[PDB]
Symmetry: C4
Subunit: 203 residues, 4 copies
């Protein structure tokens, strides 16, 4: 079963995300014109493959299962980024602290280019699970693979669950770096766009 | 044995609380008109189900066992909140640092609503184990499921041990968020009461 | 063998100290008029009971074994505190950061009383392993069970290895609390001596 | 096979480096006039001994394997330091935050002498994998066994993989100490050169 393997990988990603101190969250993959996504409320350690929720191309979820309350901005990510095959959302503490300040992460480290440019954006607040929040997410992901969400947390998407988790972890490292330096020096020194342009091509 | 299962769950919660970096503390459940609570002095890794202490409705503990020195504010929690079935107290480092500043945690993140409102209160100091401390705790828990204790730590109560531990962990995340942002910006941006009102209903 | 059991417990304490993120360090017990102490240079994960070093009452170590380079301030602790049966020294990061500022930890939390008073002292710097450093340590431990060492780290002593490790961990928590609050507010609010006097008696 | 044992030790070092929260990175040993080094892109948990890459004395890597994109500054380290047998590079978060400020780590703690002097230098930025970056690294390592790399991370080299990992971990502790104290007091108190001179000889 294709679905069983993917659901197993979603759970592995969830358990791994908590093990790395990154998780609250939700994880999905692109699947058959819709998505497979974690359900609402169930702790990761209690997830079984059976509990993963399919949402079709119309937003109708499987019968008898309640998908993540934030499935709508997973759908927004997939519609915005044709290259996204997996989406990771969490409230990692350093990411979320930066999002409380409503600041993008600037080019403080060359690994910022892993999200596609010279920044991690911070999308404006809207209530979790709403269409307003979805639209902000779609805009933020137009030219970036990851974005902060003001007063909320982090969305990262990539071509595989492993890469989306890796990118989510990388943005959390970037956030910790930014908080640690901002506490000493405001503004934090950044690399110029020429430096990032060079790195972007090397990637 | 009903009591053996509950005592096993109390110990599991304790061991899990230390594994999450949250513990010093004490854990109880509502039971037969009194409570089952961890004993004083015994490290969690040495607790056996036999060592859990029953305190009856009058405050008389089981013969030959010394309950947690802070059992009185577990009793205060149960008397104040009829919906509380489990109480978790710890000195989690971020919670406790905020409590040293004698500040409530404000609405810096929408998950603040998990404790019932727009804030985590910080009750005024009184000596651990005293009636004065119990009264402060009762007042703080009137409209909130968790509270900081000035110069002390954190109390969280919920409908199950798993939910009380989850809430305790959530407040520690909120505290870390507050400390991290306060070090950059004072005051920290907050969501307004309309935003929290919306979130409270979604819960 | 009495010595084999004690050496096994020293190693367990060392491995546990690193597991708690507290270790560089050295651990000893009072033994037969001298001490058993970790050797110099050997990583904790490579220690075998055979490698623990006996130092007699005169400072002569066992033949063929090199004791910890800081054994002299373990000896100072044992001579200063007749109640000390075990000594833990480490360079735990929060303790050591406070010691770099050459500040005592004040009464920011009632658990400060576990070291015997209203403070964790910070002894003045002297080169590791020297007599000058030993004398500073002896003075600092006169009325306290633990002390910081300026530009260095932490010494904690108690009636058992388990209690000395517990106290070392408690001082590291106190140090993290102090650093976290000092970054927001200088000076940090403290409990007054009446409050600590009450707590000291409850202990 | 000599190579199989060394490649096994490289992988063990990598897995251990991530377990200590220090890793992105790359690890090598001096070998047969060139080096054995981790390959590019492969996560440490997926490395097999077969995947370790030999680079000869000329910079020609083994056929069919792509060495770490930063192999050139491993080569720079080996050419600069005849005593280096192993090189560890990572983006440990505290090291990297200090490198974003473009500050050396000064003599805030006597263990700074483990890198050979009174400081951890911070080499000026250049694009990862370039000759310009290699030259900066060579200069920084002339009189030091470890160096920060501006906007990048940390390089540490020593006589064995175990010692290079130990030194890398020690510099990360020093960096965390510096950040923690700098957030309170700028500049941070340091030991004078006489104190470090004494420690250097004791080593
Ligand atoms: Mg969310
Ligand atoms: Mg308490
Ligand atoms: Mg030392
Ligand atoms: Mg690098």
């Amino acid at each position: 079963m294709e679905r069983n393997r993917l659901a197993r990988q979603i759970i592995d990603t969830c358990l791994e995300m908590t093990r790395l101190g990154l998780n609250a969250g939700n994880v999905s993959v692109r699947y058959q014109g819709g998505m497979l996504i974690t359900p609402t409320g169930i702790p990761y350690e209690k997830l079984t493959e059976d509990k993963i929720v399919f949402i079709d191309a119309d937003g109708q979820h499987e019968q008898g299962k309640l998908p993540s309350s934030e499935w709508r901005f997973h759908q927004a990510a997939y519609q915005t980024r044709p290259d996204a095959q997996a989406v990771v959302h969490n409230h990692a503490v350093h990411c979320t602290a930066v999002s409380i300040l409503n600041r993008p992460i600037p080019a403080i480290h060359y690994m910022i280019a892993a999200a596609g440019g010279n920044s991690i954006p911070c999308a404006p607040y809207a209530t979790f699970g709403t269409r307003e929040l979805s639209e902000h997410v779609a805009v933020a992901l137009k030219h970036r693979k990851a974005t902060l969400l003001q007063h909320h947390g982090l969305i990262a998407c990539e071509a595989s669950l492993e890469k989306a988790l890796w990118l989510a972890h990388e943005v959390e490292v970037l956030a910790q770096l930014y908080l640690s330096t901002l506490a000493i020096t405001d503004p934090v020194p950044v690399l110029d766009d020429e430096a990032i342009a060079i790195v972007l091509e090397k990637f």
